[PDB]
Amino acid sequence: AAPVLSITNASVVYPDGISTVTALDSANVEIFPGELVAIVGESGSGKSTLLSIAGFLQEPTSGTVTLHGAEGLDATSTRREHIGFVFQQPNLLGSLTAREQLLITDHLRGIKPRKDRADELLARVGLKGLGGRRVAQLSGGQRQRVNIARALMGNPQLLLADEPTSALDARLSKEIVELLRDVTKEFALATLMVTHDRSQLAYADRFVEMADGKAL
Amino acid sequence: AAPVLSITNASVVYPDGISTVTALDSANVEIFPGELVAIVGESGSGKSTLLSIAGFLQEPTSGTVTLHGAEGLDATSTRREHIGFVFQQPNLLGSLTAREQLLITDHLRGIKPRKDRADELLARVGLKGLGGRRVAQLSGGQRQRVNIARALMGNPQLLLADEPTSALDARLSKEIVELLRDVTKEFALATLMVTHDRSQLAYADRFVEMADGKALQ
Amino acid sequence: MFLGIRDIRAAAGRFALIASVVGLITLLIVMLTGLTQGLGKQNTSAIEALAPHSVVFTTAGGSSPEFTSSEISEQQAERWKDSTPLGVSQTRIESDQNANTTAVMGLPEGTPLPDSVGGFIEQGALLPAELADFLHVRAGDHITLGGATVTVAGTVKTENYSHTPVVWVDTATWQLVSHTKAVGTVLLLNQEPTIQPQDNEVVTDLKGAFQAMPAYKSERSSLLSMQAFLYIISALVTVAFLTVWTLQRTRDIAVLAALGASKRYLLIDALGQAAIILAAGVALGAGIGALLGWLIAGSVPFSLGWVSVLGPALGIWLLGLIGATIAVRNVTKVDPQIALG
Amino acid sequence: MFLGIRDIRAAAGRFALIASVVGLITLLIVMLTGLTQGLGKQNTSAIEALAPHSVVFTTAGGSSPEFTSSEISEQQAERWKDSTPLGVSQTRIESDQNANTTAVMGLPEGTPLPDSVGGFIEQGALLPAELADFLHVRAGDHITLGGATVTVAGTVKTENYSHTPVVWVDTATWQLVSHTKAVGTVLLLNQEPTIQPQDNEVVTDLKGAFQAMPAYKSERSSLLSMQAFLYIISALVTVAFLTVWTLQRTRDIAVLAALGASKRYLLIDALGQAAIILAAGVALGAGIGALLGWLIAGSVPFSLGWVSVLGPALGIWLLGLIGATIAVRNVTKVDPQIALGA
């Protein structure tokens, strides 16, 4: 009955070239365990900026972000132990195999890589047996599926998806959202999902719409 | 009544890893001078594949794509002489200045780069007296504005725009689509413009809706 | 270190070129190192074997001492107590069957020779074993030494002075062969000198005695400077390659950074990859180096030990690690937002 | 060259590092080149000056001829007619005030010396001027040469044999200094060899006559081998570095490719950039090379001309261009679709 993430009155100001630009403007968002929260809006409204704040990829220029259970930890240490990332591009490391793309997170976390866990999670994403495939043997959907699984390898409490259906057709993109929500429910994850395909709102528990860095 | 571009029954199948994928399935599109043809549809519907086809970046696995006035040329000679690319990301070369982003196209065409034209175009795109700026000193809207200007240096006949408002707030993205329409009309360009922002269709003379690689015609 | 090692597996091509460059440079350095120590022993092995504490010279016009111009008078020998005269000359040796030029060292009769050389100074000339075989001469046969007939007292091993083997003769014979009234060319002191030297005398250490040899300093110096540039070139090559190379990995490093990889982890990965590559190159260079050197040691003077192959090898590898940290410094500044692009 | 040259102007740092590596390697090569040629004349300059066509040696046990072991008996000298006896020895020279070791060459009395050296063979010893200054000996002063007191007949120019200056003497005096009844060690022939040699005799051309010098082959060979490795290292450094570098530009090359730039344009662009980088490095390295060498040539033997600095420099530059084409081969194989996405 406790929130995982709380973004209170946050704003971001990047030096856009010679001038400055307010990317995010007084964002207020709170996610609970088992919620799928979408963030809708046109391209450039501040969706990604809010996501990057939720992942401690940049401190807000004003306002506070609290991930409970990670109080007293620097920004980098917060990402490693509590947050799974589903980047817009699969961001698979070229020289590693499907299973190795889960294991390297175990390694950077300082634990003996778990092959069986990796195989179960790859199977949980419908890639059972494909642990040995390299990136060249993975389709667009398959890489995105390996990406989700990696976010799940460290068993985080915050799952951040950045338009993970942007290069997939209607069929494949539906599957990823169904998968994302199904995993969100099964493992009591708190998930932010940025999306521009409003056809996927039906699978979110709720959603925020954003314009000019202000949420509604 | 005479088209610049004729995409007729064009299909594209890339090797999606082990299998193949029909990324575009029998698309039929035609663009005449003075038209701003928008292509709407969700991300992953086949807009960019149709774009790439239109920009002679890759031949279709089946069906034919014709640009009139440039028949009998290989893929690369067609792009250098009759097409302008407004890439999704500005794709500015890092070591060049704003004006040099345009002049370098003139150099790769074999003509002594004309600085006057490079400044006139920079002004038309509203960047007068900024030709000296380097990319580090250009904001998001400005880089995109240089991109348009570079596409115009060669006086193209086909102007392709790949979601050129993807990283711009509502205010700036209006100016850019206004600039595209205004430049299209003023230079009698044939412009295809892929776009996900359905609020911008108003600026287009026509629009094509797309779903799963098929044009809803 | 996880990603770094498998980057090496999956792209062995790119690394083969750079490791080969490091391997060639280390091979050249190892072979140049062996050659400079070999030439140094070609010039100094005899004097070094005798192991004197100080060495007294004689000069003219207050110039720097030269083994080619120093003479010790009989009075000079009685002045320095606890000291023996060493005569050093080079001249032609001629037998009935063959001939050559050789170095002649003369010491007072009965002085024990170093175990490197063994035996003791006998009446007549003691020939190097290789030299006696060349001339078809046996112990007891007459030979022409510097225009004088001398009896071969026996065979000995070879030590060298100025790229020539040393023929050992009694102080009397050396005077006849070098046509001098002096008792020697220098004075060897094994104990610490307890006398203050004269206007024309000069005390020198064993090292400085080598610098009094004409070819030695002027050729070992040029060879040493060549080695210094080579070590420097290796470091710069690695730094140049590794700066450009680590820039190639920024994207993969950014993904790991976004995932939560610490700065230490990324720095260890990058440095680990360089260390493996540099290790490979240096091992192959020193391996091939020692082999070619051992294969050539018979034709060219080449000293081949463990320290002369692995000393420079470890030096180059450690220079690479220092260079690599310089080149990898920028792995901790990579903004993780590069992955969201 | 448009994109390539401006990459250099705006990011001179990274290119300075690699250009330094090319310059250092050339610097080392230029001085090693000059030093190897300097030592070659340090070993051969005197015999070259005499310029014989063929040279007849004497051997023992059918071994390779050696300057340290040859003597010609006077009848052997009469056999080969139209021949001149050359006596070559090294021994100690001692003046009233100083002494040193030098080479002594002996020829028959009255024979004119080569125009390289000039003068004539006189009874006595003709000294190099620089040696006479060191020894404080004037024309008419007595010197001890190999245990024999002879008067300095005059000064001449300086030639070298086995890292020693050559003192020129008559055949008779050389026999006294070298303690031999032979009339010489070799025979200089200015004409075509028309006499057949005995089993124990061996005729050689001027080049092969240098093999009979002890130090020459075994040290010039080692320097040449060192020089050969250096050229290979240069080629590999450029190939290694330039492959990774062109792989860095894939994105910018793709954009120019996407715009329509021909393959020749991108490849000419790339090699233009490489050629300029390589040119800068070699020029800067070879400049410092000639400078350091001229500054050192007084203390260490170093032969310095235009061909001995620019020959190797031009060779390296051509090696680099061949290497660069091997590295830039993939600039024309880049698909422009890379610009459409990230």
Ligand code: MNR
């Ligand atoms: C001014 C002094 C000298 C300089 C400078 C010099 C410069 C260099 C040099 C520079 C990079 C290298 C490599 C070098 C290497 C050699 N060198 Mn070196 N050398 N070097 C000599 C004086 C000098 N070298 C002398 C003297 C001999 C023997 C002469 C003779 O026997 O006829 C010799 C001979 C040799 C030999 C032959 C050894 C053998 O045959 O056993 C080698 C190898």
